[PDB]
Each structure stands twice: as C-alpha cells, then as structure tokens.
Recover the amino acids of this structure.
C-alpha cells in the first residue's frame, strides 16, 4: 500500500487506482477533488515513463519540467511530443536562376494551405452508415506534417502567361514558407528536412540551412512568429541552394488542378531538462531517440477544429502481453485526456465546440476500421468512443465549420426556416420539427473558392412516414429521397463550391411526414481542381 | 528514387549506409549516405522515409551530391536483355540506445560496428 | 541454488533450467505460467549477454531497454540486431549530367523489387 517498484516518486497503489498531485506529492484520488481543478491521473506502476517521453510519471503529473509544455501533456498517458511541419503562403515562379530578378519575367502569387487535406482528400463518402459505425475511412491517412498549398490569385490565367515557357525552358520556384508545431512539447534548435513534391516527383528537398535554423519552436507557434515576414525559400546566398527548377509539363499541371504539397520527412531538434536548481540544458537531448520509442506504443489522434490543428500521442495497451500494466483506456477517454476536453453534459467539449460521434466528421484508416468495426459487435453500446484503444490506431477528427444541435450551439451565419418548438428527441436534447419545407440561405461569400464540402446530420421519423426531399445547389443540383428510420442516421450529401464567390448556396430539406433533424453539419474536405489556360491564340 | 528499410529487431539511430548499385558484375557507383540523406531514425519494420513520404531522390544533384551515375551502351542493352540492376548495401553505420537509470537515453558513442562481428560469429 | 556467477541479476539455477520475469524479478518457470502470457526464458549462466548484443540477460528478459526493440528480441537467445538495406521503386535514365533536365531525352520508369 506504500511500495514503489519503479522509483517514480509515486506509490504503486496510487499508480494503479488513480491519484493526483497535492502541493508536491501524490495523494489518492477522491471524486470530491473533481469539479475543483484537479485531474485524476493513472499510470503504469512498473515503468518510470508510462508514455515513453523523456519525463518520468512524476515530473509530468506534477509539472517539474519545462514550462512550455502543454497542460494536456501532464497526464502520464499523453506524450510530450512535437510535430513540426512547413506551410506555404506565397508562391513565386520566375525564369531565372542566379540573381533571379532583372533577367526574367517573374510571377508571384499568394497562397493558402491546410495541414489536413491529404488525409481527407482520400475520403470516399460512402453515404451508408450501417452498424452504428457512423464514421468515414480514407485511403491515405498521412499526418499533419504534409501541408498542401492552394494558390488563390489564379483568377482565370495560367502560370505561363507572363512567363514565356514553351517545352524547352525551365522556370524556377521561389516561395515564402512558415514553419509550425502542432504537438505538445517545444523543439529547440529546429532543423527540418522538407520535400516539395508535385503529383509524385520531388522537385527539391530542403534541409534547414545555417541561417534558417530556428532556435525555438513552442507548440502552437510558428517560426517566424505571427507577424514576422515569412522566410524566403532559399534567399539565394552562399548557404542557399539553386532555385527550384520545374519543367513545362509540371508547369501545365500546376494549372491542371494538381497541387504542390509540402512534406517534412524528418525534423531535428532538442528538449530541455532541469538540473534541480532551474538549470536547463538542451544539448545532447535530441528527440530522435524518443520518436521511435513513443510512436511504437501510442495511438495517433488528430483534431482539426478549423483555424488550428492539434495532434497527440496517447499510450496504449497491447492486450496480448500480460506484463503490460499500462491502463487500458476508452477512445472517448483518450480524446479528453489528449485535447484538454471538458464535459458539458458528458459530451467532451473542447473549448466550447461539441465533439461527439454525432457532432463531427470522424476519419480513420483501414487497420483502425478492421479493429473497430469488429468491436461494435459485442458492445452493449454502439458508441465509437467506447472502444478500447490499442497501439497502431489512427483517428482523425474533422470538426464542421458550421454546426447546429438545436440545444445551445448554432454556427450558421444565417438561420434555418423554423424549429417550431422545444423538441426533446434527438439523442441529444432538441431536434427539429416543421413538417413543411425547411431551408437556409448560405451567402457563399464565406465558404471557400474552389473546395468541396459535405452536409451531414442525424435524421429520424419514429413511425414509418414520408421520404424527405433534399435539394442542394452550389455547383450542381441534388435531388435525393431518403427515408427516415428509427434511429437517427447520418446521410452525408456532398457538393462543391467553385466560381470564386459564385451566386449563393441552397440547401432545402423539403420533406413532409413529421420527421426529426438533429446535429446537421457542414464541413469542407477537399480542394477541387480548377483549370487555367494562359492565352487564346488567333489563327 | 530509393527507400531504405530495416528487417531486424533493433533500431538504427543516425543511419548512414554505403550501398553499391551493381549490374551483372560491375559497380556503376557506390553511394555513401550524404549530409542530407542521413536519416536519424530507422525502427525495425519501418522505412526511411515513412510509408507515405515521397522516396529519396538518388543524388538530388546538389553540392553534397555526387555526379549522376553513368552507364555505357552495352549495359544499356543488358538492361533490356533481362539482366537486372540489384542494390546491395555493403556496410551500415548507426547507433543504439542505453538508459541511465532514470530514463536518460544516450545514443552517442554506442555504435553497432563493435557488436556486429561479435554477434554474427556465434 | 541462489548463486550468480555473472552478475546478470538472474541466479544460475534459474538460468540453467528456465525462468521468467514476474513483476521485476526472475522466478522459476512452472508450466502453468504458459498459456497465460509468460514465455520460458533460458540463457547462459556464465556470461552477461548470452547473445552478444549490448544488453544483458536481465535487460532483455525483463525489458529494461529501448521500447523500440521487437518483442521477440527479449529472449536471451535472440539478438537485438538491425538489418538495413536499400530498395528501389523508381528508375530514371537520362542523357545529361549536370542540370539533368532541359538538355537531354529523359526516360523514367516505376519499378518493384524484392529482398
Ligand atoms: Ca510509473
Ligand atoms: Ca510507481
Ligand atoms: Ca547470463
Ligand atoms: Ca546468472
């Protein structure tokens, strides 16, 4: 009841059942400590660092480490682990190599990007949600370090008009990039190696030069900072490389809807350890030694939560081994433990955005589905959050930009037709009403120029009534007749937004039958290709 | 475009292999891992780069690169005559990790070269 | 029955007939431990590292080493030993040496291999 078999300053009996740190020390967890500010920690009593990170189960749980680590990384199951990647917000292509100006016809265009698009571009919608596994699967679940730019000047003109490249000459690529960090720890003395890659070929790989090595990268912060003039790609010095050359075919692909997408293969950095008196040393402490150790006993979870990206590592079980004493954890539990989620009514609010299997767009990979699908079989609850976490799982959360639950949350910049009363049957509080025609007019002046979106929601009619006729007109028209069922089911109808601030968007659930709508969401997934032809030659 | 691998049981930290691209019996050129191609991590069962990360360009043709691998017309016909290129890594250079009683893992000075001959001989 | 002639934290009598690690320590192997998750380890009682790898017969058998090593390398007879090799999945041949494009007729072809 007082023995410590791993010398982590925390007794095993506290380590097994749960504990907390009170004023410097481990104290047993009594539920009265909750709703007061203390978190219930529970770790592995046979090992020092339950998660694998450099810090022991006591340093994390108490906070006797760097003060730059996130609050959610104090849990002995969430790993202090930085995820670094490059993003591109300006593209320059010129016809010149050395002293790039004054000798060519340069074109430069400002771009925007997103770190989770390659993950959700391989998402096939497959509108069916059969066995309560109301999730979506992608083909290539990559990571948040795979940023994919999207040029936005690009009105109708191509890259050659004003460039004069015809099948023999090579333009040269210049850009202004801006690193980021979506993990929990900082990376000291960062030196990443990124690859600028077209459809399938590597134009050139950047290794951080002498001047571009940024000494500091705290989680949630970029290099340079939020107001500091992004880095010139090479800067064309004696430490720089030769400007990135591309050929005429790639030069047409860049107008053919194929995107450049930046990928950071490996990053090189350090971490900090105190010295009992506040002396922090960061030399010799490299992350490379812990990256493989951490990722091999963890489950990668990503939250997208538009306007910032988060990625976490949470330790797992490996039930096949008896001597693994890592506490088994549910997916709903690991999400809260990794993202600092609070419980509003037992629903894992992140900051105030609702996060549930019914509220957002979950995305998995094939090996995760081949363990979760055959887990929702022997369960008294069809919840995807009540599945047992195991190493190798990959879970992505796409939160919708526009969501409504008819209870407290409403994100649409307009309103619906009507809700018409105070309903309580939606599997979460209130749902919709108004048998008649229900509409909402989205200006499209707030969506994105050439992206695809998704409309999904939970719909039911308790007693076998009419089929609802949905009508969606953004770039196409949609006319579907879905029959509501006994349990609310996700429908996930797709559309596209093009034409660079086109007229409007029309989503109408015109269907009679006294049906119920709850948790209807709108979320962007892919960037749709747009074709640009430079001149039209007269004959 | 090549893609390292690891089929053993341990990881190799700070990997720097020396491979030989060899025709029927002749060495076109031997690659030693350059400054940028040295991959800090190679866990068993995993490749460098990872399973979705754009394999390495052979030389990348920089100041750290070598001159592009030249071959002759006879080899150029052999490559259509059913004779294969086959990559061979002669020696690899890497490290291993040892704890320090408190979770401190050091991987410097711990080179595998000292244990490769000792292990394979018994 | 309790002596250790190699300072590998595992007594020689356990080292000769078989043993396992239970909660941090060497315990004699009784066949009831099988079909439960424990493996019967048996090593050399005259040497620290029976296999030759950098890790001693106790660090392997218990797991007090890197968490990236395979589960099968905890046996004191299987050696922690990495085998690294290069594989080729794309071949490009061109008629040019420096700034390889724009001056030759390049051909590139995707390849598959096997070790
Ligand atoms: Ca512990
Ligand atoms: Ca303990
Ligand atoms: Ca021994
Ligand atoms: Ca012994």
């Amino acid at each position: 009841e007082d023995l410590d078999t791993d010398n982590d300053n925390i007794p095993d009996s506290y380590e097994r059942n749960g504990y907390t740190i009170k004023d410097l020390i481990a104290v047993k967890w009594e539920d009265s400590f909750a709703e007061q500010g203390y978190k219930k920690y529970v770790s592995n009593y046979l090992e020092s660092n339950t998660a694998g990170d450099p810090y022991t189960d006591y340093e994390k749980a108490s906070g006797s480490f760097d003060k730059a680590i996130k609050t959610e990384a104090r849990d002995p199951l969430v790993a202090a682990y930085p995820i670094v990647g490059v993003g591109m917000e300006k593209l320059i292509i010129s016809t010149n190599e050395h002293a790039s100006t004054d000798q060519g016809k340069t074109v430069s265009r400002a771009t925007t990007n997103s770190k989770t698009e390659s993950n959700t571009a391989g998402v096939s919608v497959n509108v069916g949600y059969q066995n309560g596994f109301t999730a979506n699967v992608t083909t290539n679940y990559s990571h948040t370090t795979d940023n994919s730019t999207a040029v936005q000047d690009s009105n109708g003109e191509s890259w050659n008009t004003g460039l004069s490249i015809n099948k023999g000459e090579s333009a040269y690529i210049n850009a202004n990039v801006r690193y980021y960090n979506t993990g929990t720890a900082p990376m000291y003395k960062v030196t990443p190696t990124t690859n600028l890659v077209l459809d399938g070929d590597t134009l050139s790989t950047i290794k951080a030069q002498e001047n571009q090595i940024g000494n500091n990268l705290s989680p949630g912060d970029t290099y340079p900072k939020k107001g500091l003039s992004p880095l010139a790609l090479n800067t064309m010095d004696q430490f720089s490389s030769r400007l990135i050359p591309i050929n005429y075919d790639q030069l047409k692909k860049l107008d053919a809807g194929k995107q450049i997408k930046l990928e950071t293969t490996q990053v090189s950095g350090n971490f900090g350890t105190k010295n009992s008196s506040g002396q922090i040393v960061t030399e010799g402490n490299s992350w490379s030694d812990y990256i493989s150790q951490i990722d091999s006993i963890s489950a990668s979870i990503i939250l997208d939560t538009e306007n910032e990206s988060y990625e976490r590592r949470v330790t797992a079980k490996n039930l096949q081994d008896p001597e693994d004493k890592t506490p088994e954890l549910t997916i709903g539990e690991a999400i809260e433990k990794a993202f600092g989620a609070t419980k509003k009514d037992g629903l894992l609010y992140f900051n105030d955005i609702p996060i549930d299997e019914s509220c957002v767009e979950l995305i998995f990979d094939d090996n995760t589905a081949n363990k979760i699908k055959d887990s929702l079989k022997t369960l008294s609850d069809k919840k995807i959050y009540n599945v047992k976490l195991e190493r190798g799982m990959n879970i992505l959360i796409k939160t919708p930009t526009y969501f409504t639950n008819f209870d407290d949350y409403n994100n649409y910049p307009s309103t619906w037709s009507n809700v018409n009363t105070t309903n309580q049957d939606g599997l979460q509080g209130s749902a919709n009403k108004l048998n008649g025609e229900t509409k909402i007019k989205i200006p499209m002046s707030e969506l994105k120029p050439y992206k695809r979106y998704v409309f999904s929601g939970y719909s039911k009619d308790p007693l076998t009534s009419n089929s609802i006729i949905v009508k969606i007109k953004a770039k196409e028209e949609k006319t579907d007749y879905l029959v509501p069922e006994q349990g609310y089911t996700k429908f996930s109808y797709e559309f596209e937004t093009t034409e660079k601030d086109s007229s409007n968007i029309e989503i109408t659930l015109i269907g009679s039958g006294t049906t119920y709508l709850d948790n209807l969401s709108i979320t962007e997934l892919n960037s749709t290709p747009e074709i640009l032809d430079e001149p039209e030659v007269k004959i």
Q: What stands out?
A: Residues 113-120 of chain B form the longest helix (8 residues). Chain B is about 10% helix and 15% strand. The CA atoms of residues 1 and 121 of chain B lie 34 Å apart. The first strand of chain B starts at residue 5 and ends at 6.
